[PDB]
Structures are given as structure tokens and as C-alpha cells.
Design a protein around this ligand. Structure first.
Ligand code: MET
Length: 515
């Protein structure tokens, strides 16, 4: 199928202000989106806020404001944050939106008509902070915000409470075999692989039915009513997960306001998601519940769920103002793969800013554009190639395919490492050929050295443009790369910018080192 590449972040609870967690998740969503745009594909990237439920209403009660005022305010803080971080998200969704609620009711009704929702009881533990049902084996002893003796979640260490309610139940138990078929048939559907193994183990152990409504009193009436039963409200997670479906059905104008909700998801060619970006703490909701609902409704399943090492639930805008926006994005994407084992100190931030961005990339951009070395201020025409020239060229030609596979996994840290390996190689080659000497001794040779250098800088910069969107534009301007050559798989190929291309005007640092 030729469809719109549909990439999502989770929608974030509005009990608290935006923070690094949310910023991180949306950054990954943004980068994936950007990579596919650079590739030349149609892209719809989605982010947003999760505004209903017990947790949000209780956060609004603490602040002595109405849930409507509170959620609207906090949503605005998330919107301002994501504008400031310089993302390129196509739409920001809110679960308070009327069109979203329509879709929730449609979906609810569909599940009901298939006999997959019945009236039942849930008697068990529940974390209000995670909005998660827990069995007794996922709880242990602990303390609260004061220090009294209570029970807590093994998942998250938040306080749990016993709940005994008549609830609408979804027949999740009936989807165990079909979920297991899905996991085995599509062995890259959950990334990384060890989290895929976690999910499969859990589903193999057995699946209880899932409570999908709560009594309206318990939610402080801050929730979507169940169709044809106003004493019950729809479970915040069914309401939340459905944002992806809603998003896939909203037509959106040139300034990002929703204007129309289509009946059939196929009209916009977005659903199902190609990638759901999530934190590790919401894996079960996305890999177990969400597909079970979709199977029940006869809707298509997402292709990939990528679960990163961070939790979903250190001020980024402050650090971006201190070290640069692109540099901060580079650091977060480079420093952490799929575990929490990463060093986010100012020491390490500066180490990578100076080491990799300034000395490796920045230096190299200045070398191939400086008037000392590139005297004609143009892309020269190469002479014949030595075997050492060819070895570097081979690396540059192989890089797009290698990075493409990493971005598609998706493993953004590995994509960056691949590019920088080539950058290190190019630097080694330059040091070796010493082109500063060649301006005097051997002009014919310098043409070849300089051309290869420029073209390596271009190709690496193209593949880095989803990570450093602003700086990539600065680099391409210095190199004098025409706009048409700054995207499209065509321009991943070696030799795309012809010799004779004039460099851009000089002024002037790309990344400046710090103490
Ligand atoms: C369907 S994604 C919902 C994520 C949840 N609101 C959270 O903050 O973790």
C-alpha cells in the first residue's frame, strides 16, 4: 500500500506541567516523522493531551479550579512547550474534543454490538496515578506523600486502593490466542525485542477480562458517558487509546485547527499507525488492550510499537536556551537507547557537544568551506580516484541504506552512530590528505579531496537533518546545496550535487565549544 506514514506520541496526562519525559517521547515521534518526510513520503505526526479521569480531576480539586479550566490551561502549557521545542507535529489532539468523544462512542458501540462488552464487577487493586488495574502479585508494602503504612504498585511505586464496582467489562480473555498469533506472525511489531518477549510471556500466562467503565461518582463526573447508560463513564484508557483513531479521521487546516471528522478512516489513508512511540510504562495498554479492541471492532492493527527506556509520567527549554535546541535533541537521542542507563550530566552534554558536534561535524564543515582550502568557493570537479579515495566513497554510498534500516526499526541512536562513524572516517581522510598543503603542491589532487569531503558532509548532513533540523539548513546553506537536493531518496545517492555549484556566503560558528 501507498499510504500516509502515520506516527504518534502518547497523549500526556494533564495533572502536571510538561517535563522532559513528554518532551522526549514527542521528540522521537517528531524525528521519525521528519525522517519519512526527508525520504519524500506523506506524513501525519500526532501528539496531544489526555484530560479525563480520576487523576486529572483530583489534580484540579487540589488546585481549587474546575476540571475544564485546569485541563484547558495545562493543555496550553503543553502546546507552548512543543512550539518552543521546534517540533513539526501535524496535529495536537485533546480528549475533551467533541469529535474525539464521538469516535469513542462509535467504537464503544461497535464493541458492544460484537458481544465483546458485558456488565460485570471488578473487585481488585487499582493505581489512580497509572489509571491501571493491578492483580495482587503486582503490589507490595510502602508509604504515601505523608508516610503512613499503605500498599503500592510494583510497576510504579504509586499508591494503590481497593475498588469494588459494578463495571462494564471487555472480554479481553477471548483475545489471547489471536494476540499471540499477531505477535508471532509479525516479530518486529514490538520494539525492542526484549519488550516484545515481555509482552508475549504475559499474554501466555493468561488474560483477565478488562474493566472498561467506572461509576460516574468515582471519576468526579470528569469522563465520557457510556452510550445508553449515563450512570457509567468510559475508562480513561479506552478513551485515551482511541485518540489514535480519532486523529486518523480529522481533516486539519494550514494552521492546525481540526475542521471535519470523516466517517471512514480509509478516506485519509492514515490508520493504522505505522509507529506508536511510547514509554516503557504504558506497554501493556498499547500491545495487549489496544490490539484487542481493534480485533474486536474489525479494525487494522498498528505495524510497530516502539517503547523507549524512559518513563512517560531538568527543564528542557532552559537547557536548550543554554546549549542550543538541535544540540539538546542530538544529546537526548544519542545518549540513550532502549535502557535507562545513560548519563545526562552537564559534563557529558558538554563532552558530546564539543567532541562530536563541534570537533567532528562542525570542524569538518568549516574545513571544506574555508577560503584557505576551498579557494574558488565552489564544488570542484574531481580528478581520478585513489584506492583510499574509493574506500571513503564506499562508506558514503553505504551510509544511506544502513541509516535507513536503523530509522525504520526504529533505533535512532544507531542511525546517529552510523552517520558519525562516516564523519569520523571523513575527518581521518582529511587529516591524511592534508588538503591545506595541497593548495600549493598539487591543485589537481585537492579537487578530488575537496569534492569527496563536501559530498560526504552533504550526505551525512541529509541523514542527520531529522536530528538537527535547524543546523542542517545552516550547513546546506554554507555548502550552497540547492533546496531541491535537501530531500528525496534521489539525493541520498553519491554525486547528486554537481561540480560548479557555488558555496553560500560567509559571515560565524556552527556549534561553539564550552568550558
Ligand atoms: C494512549 S497514550 C496515554 C498515555 C497516558 N495518558 C500517560 O500519560 O501515560
Amino acid at each position: 500500500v501507498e499510504k500516509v506514514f502515520f506516527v504518534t506520541s502518547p497523549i500526556y496526562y494533564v495533572n502536571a506541567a510538561p517535563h522532559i519525559g513528554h518532551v522526549y517521547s514527542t521528540l522521537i515521534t517528531d524525528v521519525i516523522g521528519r525522517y519519512h518526510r526527508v525520504k519524500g513520503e506523506r506524513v501525519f505526526a500526532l501528539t496531544g493531551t489526555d484530560e479525563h479521569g480520576q487523576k486529572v480531576a483530583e489534580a484540579a480539586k487540589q488546585k481549587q479550579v474546575s476540571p475544564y479550566d485546569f485541563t484547558t490551561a495545562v493543555a496550553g502549557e503543553f502546546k507552548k512547550c512543543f512550539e518552543q521545542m521546534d517540533y513539526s507535529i501535524d496535529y495536537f489532539i485533546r480528549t475533551t474534543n467533541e469529535q474525539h468523544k464521538a469516535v469513542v462512542k462509535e467504537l464503544w458501540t461497535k464493541l458492544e454490538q460484537k458481544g465483546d462488552i458485558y456488565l460485570g464487577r471488578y473487585e481488585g487493586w487499582y493505581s489512580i496515578s497509572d489509571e491501571s488495574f493491578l492483580t495482587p502479585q503486582n503490589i507490595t508494602d510502602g508509604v504515601d506523600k505523608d508516610g503512613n503504612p499503605c500498599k503500592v504498585s510494583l510497576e510504579s511505586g504509586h499508591v494503590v486502593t481497593w475498588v469494588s464496582e459494578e463495571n462494564y467489562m471487555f472480554r479481553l480473555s477471548a483475545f489471547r490466542e489471536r494476540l499471540l498469533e499477531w505477535y508471532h506472525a509479525n516479530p518486529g511489531c514490538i520494539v525492542p525485542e526484549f519488550r516484545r518477549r515481555e509482552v508475549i510471556r504475559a499474554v501466555e500466562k493468561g488474560l483477565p477480562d478488562l474493566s472498561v467503565s467506572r461509576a460516574r461518582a468515582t471519576l468526579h463526573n470528569w469522563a465520557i458517558p457510556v452510550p445508553g447508560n449515563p450512570d457509567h463513564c468510559v475508562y480513561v484508557w479506552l478513551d485515551a487509546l482511541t485518540n489514535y483513531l480519532t486523529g486518523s479521521r480529522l481533516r486539519v487546516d494550514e494552521s492546525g485547527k481540526e475542521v471535519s471528522l470523516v466517517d471512514d478512516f480509509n478516506e485519509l489513508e492514515r490508520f493504522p499507525a505505522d509507529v506508536h512511540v511510547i514509554g516503557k510504562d504504558i506497554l501493556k495498554f498499547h500491545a495487549i488492550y489496544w490490539p484487542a479492541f481493534l480485533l474486536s471492532a474489525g479494525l487494522p492493527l498498528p505495524k510497530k510499537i516502539v517503547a523507549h527506556g524512559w518513563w512517560t509520567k531538568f527543564d528542557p527549554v532552559e537547557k536548550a536556551e543554554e546549549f542550543g535546541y538541535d544540540a539538546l535533541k542530538y544529546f537526548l537521542l544519542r545518549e540513550s537507547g532502549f535502557s535507562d542507563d545513560g548519563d545526562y550530566s552537564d559534563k557529558n552534554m558538554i563532552a558530546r557537544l564539543n567532541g562530536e558536534l563541534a570537533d567532528t561535524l562542525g570542524n569538518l564543515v568549516m574545513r571544506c568551506t574555508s577560503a584557505k582550502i576551498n579557494v574558488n568557493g565552489e564544488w570542484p570537479s574531481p580528478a581520478a580516484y585513489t584506492e583510499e579515495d574509493e574506500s571513503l566513497i564506499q562508506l558514503i554510498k553505504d551510509l544511506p541504506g544502513t541509516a535507513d534500516h536503523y530509522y525504520l526499526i526504529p533505533d535512532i541512536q544507531k542511525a546517529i552512530i552510523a552517520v558519525f562513524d562516516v564523519l569520523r572516517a571523513i575527518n581521518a581522510y582529511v587529516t591524511d590528505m592534508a588538503p591545506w598543503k595541497l593548495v600549493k603542491t598539487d591543485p589537481e589532487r585537492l579537487r578530488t579531496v575537496l569534492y569527496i569531503t563536501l559530498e560526504g558532509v552533504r550526505v551525512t548532513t541529509l541523514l542527520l537533518s531529522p536530528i538537527l533540523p535547524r543546523k542542517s539548513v545552516v550547513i546546506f546553506d554554507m555548502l550552497g546545496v540547492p533546496e531541491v537536493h535537501r530531500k528525496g531518496i534521489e539525493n541520498f545517492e553519491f554525486g547528486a550535487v554537481p561540480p560548479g555549484t557555488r558555496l553560500g556566503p560567509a559571515v560565524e560558528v556552527l556549534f561553539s565549544k564550552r568550558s
